[PDB]
Amino acid sequence: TPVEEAQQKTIEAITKAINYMAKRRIGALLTIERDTGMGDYIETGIPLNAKVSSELLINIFIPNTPLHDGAVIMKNNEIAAAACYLPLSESPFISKELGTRHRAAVGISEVTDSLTIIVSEETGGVSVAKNGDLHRELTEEALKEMLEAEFK
Amino acid sequence: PTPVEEAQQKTIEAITKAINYMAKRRIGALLTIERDTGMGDYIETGIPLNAKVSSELLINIFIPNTPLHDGAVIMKNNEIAAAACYLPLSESPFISKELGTRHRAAVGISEVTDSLTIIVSEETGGVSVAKNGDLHRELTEEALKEMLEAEF
Ligand SMILES: [Mg+2]
């Protein structure tokens, strides 16, 4: 359908951006709203309401730029805002090997049904936070499967 | 002030803040503001954004060595329509020999539209404007802001 094709385009854009950032070890934090509304978190960031593209996602997260710290939040197949605040998890089961981006991703995942992707600035490793759990060191195939499961 | 007027003032302030940031850092930039002549044909050559204006987004677009930094940003009323757009190159004999492709592209679009284009030189950080085939160079921050206010 037109909307199934739009979803696949968004998945491709996300995975291309994530792959680029993983290769360069560019830290990134990208939350995808699901059924739990995240307007309160969107409002803490810089409003964009932009078309998704791999290029825009990459440009947002470039180190030492205005938009690179904080989360991108996507809603209805658009980038709602960048540089957003997310609540830090207080879970005692998050390794101290991991950074603030990962604790923020886990945190938002504890209070929403959203899917958050994280790229580590230390290793380029890619992880996903969902339902309070953090899935580490994801392959490209695994990330794609998660996104397809989430967008279905 | 009506909401439209306030929105316009916020857009002007966003533009001037971004231009000043890039000028100080010698970040080359090429920003065309649509006026009464429609620029859809040029917008369609770039990466669609259809995004809300912010100084932060304008800056992030033009960071050197990133996907979006080459080509023109085209704005519509209070929107960043697209980035990395093509513009026609002017053949004017009055374009200084010291100037690069960004300036020639700015003059070029200004010869076939009533748009206003702002250029930041990557060599000097100097700021210029192209309108109606004329290039005005080495603008102070006050001169640029007044030009934008006169343009709306
Ligand atoms: Mg370059």
Curated annotation (Swiss-Prot), chain A:
Family the UniProt entry places it in: Belongs to the adenylate cyclase family. DacA/CdaA subfamily.
Assign the protein's first listed, main location to one coarse class. Answer: membrane
Q: Which residues form the signal peptide?
A: none
State the encoding gene.
cdaA
| Occurrences of domain DAC (ranges) | 1-140
Task: Fill in the subunit field for this protein.
Answer: Probably a homodimer. Interacts with CdaR. May interact with GlmM.
What happens without the gene? Increased sensitivity to the beta-lactam antibiotic cefuroxime (CEF), upon overexpression of the c-di-AMP phosphodiesterase GdpP greatly increased sensitivity to CEF. Double disA-cdaA mutants cannot be made, suggesting they are lethal, while double disA-cdaS and cdaA-cdaS mutants are viable. Depletion of cdaA in double disA-cdaA deletion cells leads to cell lysis. Exponentially growing cells are extremely sensitive to H(2)O(2), no change in response to methyl methanesulfonate.
Q: Which GO terms describe its cellular component?
A: plasma membrane
Name of the protein this chain belongs to? Cyclic di-AMP synthase CdaA
Induction details: Constitutively expressed, part of the cdaA-cdaR-glmM-glmS operon.
Q: What class of enzyme is it?
A: transferase
Keywords, A to Z, come to:
ATP-binding, Cell membrane, Membrane, Nucleotide-binding, Nucleotidyltransferase, Transferase, Transmembrane, Transmembrane helix
**Role of this protein:** One of 3 paralogous diadenylate cyclases (DAC) in this bacteria, catalyzing the condensation of 2 ATP molecules into cyclic di-AMP (c-di-AMP). Upon expression in E.coli leads to c-di-AMP synthesis. Probably the main producer of c-di-AMP for the cell; is probably implicated in control of peptidoglycan synthesis. In B.subtilis c-di-AMP is a second messenger that mediates growth, DNA repair and cell wall homeostasis; it is toxic when present in excess.
Task: State what inhibits or activates this protein.
Answer: DAC activity is stimulated about 20-fold in E.coli by coexpression with CdaR.
Q: Which EC numbers characterise this protein's activity in its record?
A: 2.7.7.85
Report the subcellular localization.
Cell membrane
As one GO molecular function, the record gives: diadenylate cyclase activity
Domain of life, per UniProt, equals Bacteria
Swiss-Prot record, chain B:
Which GO cellular component does the record give, naming just one?
plasma membrane
Localization terms from the record: Cell membrane
Positions of disulphide bridges: none
- Residue span, DAC domain: 2-141
> Which GO-annotated molecular functions does the record name?
adenylate cyclase activity; ATP binding; diadenylate cyclase activity
Q: What UniProt keywords are attached to this protein's entry?
A: ATP-binding, Cell membrane, Membrane, Nucleotide-binding, Nucleotidyltransferase, Transferase, Transmembrane, Transmembrane helix
Q: What induces it?
A: Constitutively expressed, part of the cdaA-cdaR-glmM-glmS operon.
GO biological process, alphabetically ordered? cAMP biosynthetic process
Which domain of life, per UniProt? Bacteria
The EC code for this enzyme is 2.7.7.85
Any inhibitors or activators noted? DAC activity is stimulated about 20-fold in E.coli by coexpression with CdaR.
Question: What changes when the gene is disrupted?
Answer: Increased sensitivity to the beta-lactam antibiotic cefuroxime (CEF), upon overexpression of the c-di-AMP phosphodiesterase GdpP greatly increased sensitivity to CEF. Double disA-cdaA mutants cannot be made, suggesting they are lethal, while double disA-cdaS and cdaA-cdaS mutants are viable. Depletion of cdaA in double disA-cdaA deletion cells leads to cell lysis. Exponentially growing cells are extremely sensitive to H(2)O(2), no change in response to methyl methanesulfonate.
What is catalysed by this protein? 2 ATP = 3',3'-c-di-AMP + 2 diphosphate
What is the membrane topology noted in the UniProt record heading this document?
Multi-pass membrane protein
Quote the function comment for this protein: One of 3 paralogous diadenylate cyclases (DAC) in this bacteria, catalyzing the condensation of 2 ATP molecules into cyclic di-AMP (c-di-AMP). Upon expression in E.coli leads to c-di-AMP synthesis. Probably the main producer of c-di-AMP for the cell; is probably implicated in control of peptidoglycan synthesis. In B.subtilis c-di-AMP is a second messenger that mediates growth, DNA repair and cell wall homeostasis; it is toxic when present in excess.
The entry sums up its family as follows: Belongs to the adenylate cyclase family. DacA/CdaA subfamily.
Partners and quaternary state?
Answer: Probably a homodimer. Interacts with CdaR. May interact with GlmM.
> What is the official name of this protein in its record?
Cyclic di-AMP synthase CdaA
Q: Which gene encodes it?
A: cdaA
